[PDB]
Amino acid sequence: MNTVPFTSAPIEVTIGIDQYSFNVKENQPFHGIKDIPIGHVHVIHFQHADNSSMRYGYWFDCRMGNFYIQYDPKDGLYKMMEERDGAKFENIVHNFKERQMMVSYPKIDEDDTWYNLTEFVQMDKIRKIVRKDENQFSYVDSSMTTVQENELSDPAHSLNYTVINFKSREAIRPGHEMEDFLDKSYYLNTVMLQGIFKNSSNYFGELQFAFLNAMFFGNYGSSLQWHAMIELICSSATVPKHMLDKLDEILYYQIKTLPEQYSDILLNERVWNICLYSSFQKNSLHNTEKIMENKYPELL
Amino acid sequence: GAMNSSNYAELFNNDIKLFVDDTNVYRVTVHKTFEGNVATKAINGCIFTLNPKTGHLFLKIIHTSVWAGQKRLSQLAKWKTAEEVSALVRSLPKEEQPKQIIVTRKAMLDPLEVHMLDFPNIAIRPTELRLPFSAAMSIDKLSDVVMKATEPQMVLFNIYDDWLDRISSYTAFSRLTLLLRALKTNEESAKMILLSDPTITIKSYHLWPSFTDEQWITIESQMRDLILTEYGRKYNV
Ligand SMILES: O=C(CCOc1ccccc1)NO
């Protein structure tokens, strides 16, 4: 189990760690989060009590270094940093644990939610979507735009998701216009899976990362990406059977975890009704269709 | 954006544009089978592609053989239309290609956009106008060439005959749509109006009769009457 210590908490803030969250008061004696499960990526995220504008946070993998949080009063945010002195770090964490100044990552033993939401998400791929190579961890916030959003303005601060566009020469083979537009299997299997992503695990990883950025930061561009990757599969007549089964599990856990009160902005009616009721795969997402119908029957 | 009452004069500026109407592309007769079921039999159709400034009508005849062995024909017809319009544009010199293509039915937007991806600078636009181009097959010479075709064929007509020697393209288009609206609302009456006087003939390269300016005003008046009437006869007013 790993630890992300905090130097201090000078401003009142709601802190999230994965799907958990807690409130820290201004100058409360808070020194971080312990017992973080090893083997998964994680996200630690923040919403200031005084400015609900800008949710922001950091994707990280404790196997890649010793990371801590320190508020910066000039830039006005909690910043993740790497501590290179391993003996300094262990000594800091041990003192904070002995004084019991840390919250415990509060995983229930039965609970596979976080694994199920991040199964295919890798830190190395996150770092290619979020480019800042001098750090091992990746900052995301509510306002960051995607490369595709920029095409339609600071590139350093962009989300470089794979561009998907159903009315594009990449998506449509000359002479197969109608075929490729109504059945996107070519674009899914040859262009995207074989060509760009290499395998379905990398595809699912980006799909999962996009959902999580939409959910945790209300990042609109990420929501667009999540829906596009779903729609590309559902609009393909020819999808490997193992991918459909896995997609159903992926989406089931995303819909299960979504805040009930955010469904109106985070779920696109057109995509979901098309995917569950009109698309080639309308009959292939049994778990997802059941949870959607029982939890958001209004959207449909 | 969409073409409507407010931006109507844009049709007659000097930016090349084409209207595309797909109504008459896939045409059928519905009939009973010996077993008493219902079947369709396709008949020849046409794409109606019109330059509203010049009257240039590129009439692509759709022969029934293009439907053989195909499913979902109403959907295929929109993609066939887009394929042929794309082929037409590519066949024109660069300086003759349109800067905009206006489709008369919104369901043509995605088919045409996808076929024209090679032409990102050609705007594909819908319209809110309820244009009467479906009545093109009520023009005898156009109907005749479509029904006689034995293979795919493109036939060229000026839909304005020689009118542009005497009137502007705004006026010519208004006359065209009045004639076609009338033919759509009551074909028999419209055709009676146009031919009642045997001394006025249709030139061999023309589609409509050789009315003088004064006779066109009368003709145009009679077409308005017809349309207002049928609107009463229809709604009882
Ligand atoms: O004879 C002409 C000029 C060429 O007319 C057309 C007609 C249809 C398509 C292309 C050109 N004016 O009457």
| Number of C-beta neighbours around residue A287 at 10 A | 16
Q: Are A211 and A226 in contact (CB under 8 A)?
A: yes
B99 CA to centre of ligand 1 in angstroms: 19
User: What is the rounded distance in angstroms from the CA atom of residue A35 to the CA atom of residue A76?
Assistant: 28
Buried b (16+ CB within 10 A) or exposed e, B17-46: bbbbbbbbbbbeeeeeeeeeeeeeebebbb
The side-by-side arrangement of strands in the sheet containing A20-24 is A20-24, A13-17, A42-48, A56-60, A138-141
Contacts of B56 (CB under 8 A, 6+ apart): B50, B156, B158
- In terms of DSSP bridges, do strands B17-21 and A56-60 run parallel, antiparallel, or are they unpaired? unpaired
| Number of C-beta neighbours around residue A165 at 10 A | 14
- In terms of DSSP bridges, do strands A138-141 and A103-104 run parallel, antiparallel, or are they unpaired? unpaired
B68-75 — which CB contacts under 8 Å span 24+ positions? B73/B26, B73/B42, B74/B26
Residues B111, B114, B118, B123, Cα dihedral to 10°: 70
- In terms of DSSP bridges, do strands A32-36 and A103-104 run parallel, antiparallel, or are they unpaired? parallel
User: What is the rounded distance in angstroms from the CA atom of residue B48 to the CA atom of residue B44?
Assistant: 13
| Number of C-beta neighbours around residue B5 at 10 A | 7
First to last CA, chain A: 42
A31 CA to centre of ligand 1 in angstroms: 82
Contacts of A226 (CB under 8 A, 6+ apart): A207, A210, A211, A214
Question: Where is A32: in which H helix or E strand?
Answer: strand A32-36
User: What is the rounded distance in angstroms from the CA atom of residue A207 to the CA atom of residue A222?
Assistant: 9
| Interface contact flag, A169 B117, Cβ < 8 Å | yes
Orientation angle between helical segments B169-185 and B213-235, nearest 10 degrees: 40
Looking up tokens 């043509």 gives B108
For chain B, the structural domain boundaries read: 9-163, 164-237
User: What is the rounded distance in angstroms from the CA atom of residue A6 to the CA atom of residue A1?
Assistant: 17
CA A112 to chain centre: 16
| Interface contact flag, B111 A168, Cβ < 8 Å | no
> For residue A181, which residues of chain B lie inside 8 Å, CB to CB?
110-111, 114
Contacts of A279 (CB under 8 A, 6+ apart): A231, A234, A235
| Number of C-beta neighbours around residue B220 at 10 A | 17
B190-193 — which CB contacts under 8 Å span 24+ positions? B190/B138, B190/B223, B190/B226, B191/B138, B193/B219, B193/B222, B193/B223, B193/B226
Which protein residue's CA is at the shortest distance from atom 2 of ligand 1? B158
Looking up tokens 């902005």 gives A265
CA angle, residues A174, A178, A183, in degrees to nearest 5? 105
Tokens read off for B206: 């023309």
What type of residue sits at position A297? P
DSSP-based three-state secondary structure for A44: strand
First to last CA, chain B: 36
CATH superfamily of B9-163: Prp8 RNase H domain, palm region (3.30.420.230)
User: What is the rounded distance in angstroms from the CA atom of residue A242 to the CA atom of residue A194?
Assistant: 16
CA angle, residues A126, A252, A194, in degrees to nearest 5? 50
Cα–Cα distances in Å, from A297 out to A227, A262, A292, A294, B79?
A: 18, 15, 7, 6, 35
Give the domain B164-237 fold.
Acyl-CoA Binding Protein (1.20.80)
| φ, ψ dihedrals at A70, nearest 5° | -145, 125
CA dihedral over A66, A30, A143, A298, signed as positive or negative: positive
Residues of A at the B interface (Cβ-Cβ below 8 Å)? Answer: 167-169, 172, 177-178, 181
User: What is the rounded distance in angstroms from the CA atom of residue B51 to the CA atom of residue B12?
Assistant: 9
